[PDB]
Amino acid sequence: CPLMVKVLDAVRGSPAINVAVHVFRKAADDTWEPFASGKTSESGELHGLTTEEEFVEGIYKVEIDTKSYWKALGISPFHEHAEVVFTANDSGPRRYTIAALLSPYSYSTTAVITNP
Amino acid sequence: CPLMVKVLDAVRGSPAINVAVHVFRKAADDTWEPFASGKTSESGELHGLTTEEEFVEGIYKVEIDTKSYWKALGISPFHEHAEVVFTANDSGPRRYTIAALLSPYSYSTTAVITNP
Amino acid sequence: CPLMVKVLDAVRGSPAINVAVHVFRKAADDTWEPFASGKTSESGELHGLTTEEEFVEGIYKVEIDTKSYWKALGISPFHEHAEVVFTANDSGPRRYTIAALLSPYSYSTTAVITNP
Amino acid sequence: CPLMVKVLDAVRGSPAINVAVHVFRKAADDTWEPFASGKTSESGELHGLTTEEEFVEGIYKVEIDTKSYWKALGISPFHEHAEVVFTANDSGPRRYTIAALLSPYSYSTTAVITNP
Ligand SMILES: O=C(c1cc(O)cc(F)c1)c1cc(O)c(O)c([N+](=O)[O-])c1
Ligand SMILES: O=C(c1cc(O)cc(F)c1)c1cc(O)c(O)c([N+](=O)[O-])c1
């Protein structure tokens, strides 16, 4: 599992469950070719997005549908979504966890990169 | 100013100076039109991007060039940029501060909104 | 002002108004002496806590009463308070902004330091 | 495992390894009785701090030795430590994860509470 996305809820103090996540890879014409997508689990985690051989170097975009998450909870959100754009495996492939901590008017995102 | 952008550096504990910022607005045909741009000052703040007349209802995108900021300090950061996308003035005119707190592998963003 | 405290609300996207703040300084016998206190203004800012003469080298503690803030909005938050402890003026006098961004189950804090 | 502490590094984009963590429970005289302690693993996590029967309702303090972590990496830090103070199991015991995302001049902390 070379790429995982984890989403947390700072209002409830819980994983953010059933959050839609879309991943894209930058094409040669600099438009976003869809790559993988899913919804976060009961633990706020989305596994199995890609494979070691498919996850080559390049620029990737992770789009987290924060607006729908807050709307489903009946809370007014600020952002249309939370986008995270990064370059992958530029010094070799590792395991990437892209985490996001969500509030209605603010979010925090980090990368936690480890080696197996 | 109806729209201000403020950028801080969590590694040095200081304003993030000379950070390029580009603002776009979503057009009726769903494309991103360039709206305003500038660089943060010595205080980390970017003022004067727009006017109350020009800053109509719409969906706006603030793109903060975090990568060039870190590269100039010798750091290869994780993110290509930090993008903040939001609906503005849905309930009438407001003043928006878009703040970002930067680390090489993480950032936080928040909105501070006041009613003039 | 050599020491300013700023508190923001990540749920409403606004300054956190009327937040009580207590400052302490570590004495030679390792106890915490009350140094200054106040409440955040309409802008979320607390100015006027100390003077350049009084704000000598030392270890300072800023205690932000986040619990009363959330309780007054009907929310039972996770944290009892947010405490920020730091050495000040180790390399000569500086101006410190201590910022906190509040959610019911999470907070972020940062220091913005400038040289007068 | 009713209580876990997880510490991340926003500069390196990695778990924060070998970070000292001390937990205390508030006594009746309002001083901090030590409760449990440990060091974070290769994954940034500290497990096994207490048991279901020992982790009763009360106010707990988690002290994360952020200063030593940054010093060992040769990086100037702002804070003396990161303290998280909270009330536990006030509506029944769950599983508490206390997470902290560290930068030299800033940190973010959240609670992720789940039920088994
Ligand atoms: O967004 C923040 C912010 C972000 C965080 O992750 C943590 C935190 F304590 C504050 C911010 C906004 C502002 O308008 C502002 O002036 C400042 N400041 O002065 O330092 C900060
Ligand atoms: O990135 C974070 C994170 C972000 C913040 O703004 C503040 C903070 F304390 C942690 C994170 C990453 C993980 O992999 C993870 O498991 C968790 N967790 O379970 O709690 C959190």
Cβ atoms D20, D63 nearer than 8 A: no
- Measured in residues, chain D has a length of 116
Provide the token pair at B21: 């910022």
Could you state, in order of their start, the residue ranges of all structural domains in chain D?
Answer: 3-114
Q: What pairing do the DSSP bridges indicate for beta strands B95-103 and B32-39?
A: unpaired
Q: Is the dihedral of CA C37, C21, C83, C15 positive or negative?
A: negative
Residues 76-95, chain C, touching B (beta carbon < 8 A): none
Put residue C60 in one of left, alpha, beta given phi > 0 → left and psi -120 to 50 → alpha: beta
Q: Smallest Cα–Cα separation from C17: which of C2, C28, C5, C27?
A: C5
Please state the φ and ψ torsions of residue A68, each to the nearest 5 degrees. Answer: -65, -35
Give the integer Cα–Cα distance in Å for A35 and A25. 6
What is the secondary structure of C62-89 as a DSSP string? EEE-HHHHHHHTT---SBS-EEEEEEES
Which method, experimentally, gave rise to this model? Answer: X-ray
Architecture of domain C3-114: Sandwich (2.60)
Distance from CA of C41 to the nearest CA of D (A): 23
Q: Cβ of B104 and D11 within 8 Å?
A: yes
- Half-sphere exposure of B66 toward its Cβ, with a 13 Å CA cutoff? 30
CB-closest option in D80, D103, D108 to C106: D108
A-chain residues within 8 Å CB-CB of D13? 110-113
Give the integer Cα–Cα distance in Å for C111 and D74. 19
Q: Is the dihedral of CA A95, D103, B75, B100 positive or negative?
A: positive
Please state the φ and ψ torsions of residue A58, each to the nearest 5 degrees. Answer: 155, 180
What is the secondary structure of chain A as a DSSP string? --EEEEEEETTTTEE--S-EEEEEEE-TTS-EEEEEEEE--TTSEE--S--TTT--SEEEEEEE-HHHHHHHTT---SBS-EEEEEEE-BTB--EEEEEEEEETTEEEEEEEEE--
Chain breaks in chain D (C to N over 2.5 A) after: none
Binding-site annotation: residue ranges of B: 6, 45, 108
Burial class of residue A48 in the structure, from the number of CB atoms within 10 Å of its CB (0-12 exposed, 13-18 middle, 19+ buried): exposed
Note the Cα C86 to chain centre separation in Å: 11
Give the integer Cα–Cα distance in Å for B37 and A57. 31
Burial class of residue A44 in the structure, from the number of CB atoms within 10 Å of its CB (0-12 exposed, 13-18 middle, 19+ buried): buried
- Measured in residues, chain C has a length of 116
Q: What pairing do the DSSP bridges indicate for beta strands B82-88 and D58-64?
A: unpaired
Torsion angle of the four alpha carbons A103, B10, D68, D17, in this order, in degrees rounded to the nearest 10: 60
Q: Smallest Cα–Cα separation from B50: which of B32, B29, B24, B74?
A: B24
Q: Smallest Cα–Cα separation from A8: which of B3, C78, B45, D97?
A: D97
Burial class of residue A32 in the structure, from the number of CB atoms within 10 Å of its CB (0-12 exposed, 13-18 middle, 19+ buried): middle
Contacts 24+ apart (CB under 8 A), A31-37: A32/A61, A35/A60, A36/A3
Please state the φ and ψ torsions of residue C28, each to the nearest 5 degrees. Answer: -60, -30
Resolution in A: 1.7
Amino acid in the structure at residue D83: E
Give the integer Cα–Cα distance in Å for A45 and A49. 11
Q: Smallest Cα–Cα separation from C83: which of D66, B75, B71?
A: D66
Provide the token pair at C10: 């990540």
Q: Cβ of A10 and C78 within 8 Å?
A: no
Q: Cβ of B79 and A59 within 8 Å?
A: no
Q: Which residues contact B48 (CB under 8 A, 6 or more apart)?
A: B1, B38
The atom of ligand 1 lying closest to the CA of C108 is 7
Q: Which residues contact D114 (CB under 8 A, 6 or more apart)?
A: A14, A15, A43, D94, D95, D97
Q: Which residues contact B67 (CB under 8 A, 6 or more apart)?
A: B77, B79, B80, B81
First-last CA distance in chain B: 10
- Given a contact as 3+ CB pairs under 8 Å, which chains touch B? A, C, D
